[PDB]
Symmetry: C3
Subunit: 116 residues, 3 copies
């Protein structure tokens, strides 16, 4: 079904709008993302450098989204159950950090060869 | 664990079959074109990422369904959030191929 | 600046937990620093050096998200008394594709370099 694509596309924009509204950390990163994305589109670099500059930052977005989905499950569980170790939320937090450290290292290495 | 989940996602998820095709297709096309290593890697890694995310999405959807048969605001929020991550990976793959191939 | 310090602590607590508990994570931690060392020491261009480190770091990201899902299934599987590891499977499947992707990357990158 071709309409199945427009359906799953609907479920997506719903989760993008809901991430931007409820999740605060998603908003700040989205700023640094669209900035960096634009910067990459105007930097005089090669298609490999440009893609690597854009994708590394967009990975932060993807990971944060998966982190928000996990938290929504812990919150769901937290409504029925009383105690929460919050260890699942701690692991999803680390994943986002590693994505950021990655994008930072990516941008530095790529720009210090470029500007260097 | 590994092969049990890839055969489960293939038999069940229709969008995963379309990505499995896409991954292998990407590997081929990346190998045919006269491009350098980094280009070939980016051509493949981008599509493989879409698959990696879609698997994590289906993993979450599996948990949401196992928690309760009942839809909650927070459970619906979970599914939609993961479904959005897949889109970004798809778009990221689209951007990747465009920047690389327009330059070629 | 108070929310940022709070989140980074959650990340250290998460990293320290994954290290102590998950053996596969310790192997991947070794892999990252080793990937970094190998990628840097080789007279290698920027994009390749990034891709050599990025690909291995991506593995660590998926392993962490996987272990996060595993923790949720185990909170359920403790209070639900019903175990259908459909989720734990799909998680490990993702990490595998991350690893395959990493090997391919290192292959194609290092193959072209020494070509």
């Amino acid at each position: 079904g071709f309409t199945r694509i427009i359906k799953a596309a609907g479920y997506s924009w719903k989760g993008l709008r809901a991430a931007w509204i409820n999740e605060a950390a998603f908003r700040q990163e989205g700023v640094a993302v669209l900035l960096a994305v634009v910067i990459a589109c105007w930097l005089d670099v090669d298609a490999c450098t440009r893609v690597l500059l854009i994708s590394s930052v967009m990975l932060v977005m993807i990971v944060e989204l998966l982190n928000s989905a996990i938290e929504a499950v812990v919150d769901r569980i937290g409504s029925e159950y009383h105690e929460l170790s919050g260890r699942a939320k701690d692991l999803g937090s680390a994943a986002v950090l590693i994505a950021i450290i990655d994008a930072v290292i990516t941008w530095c290495i790529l720009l210090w060869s470029h500007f260097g």
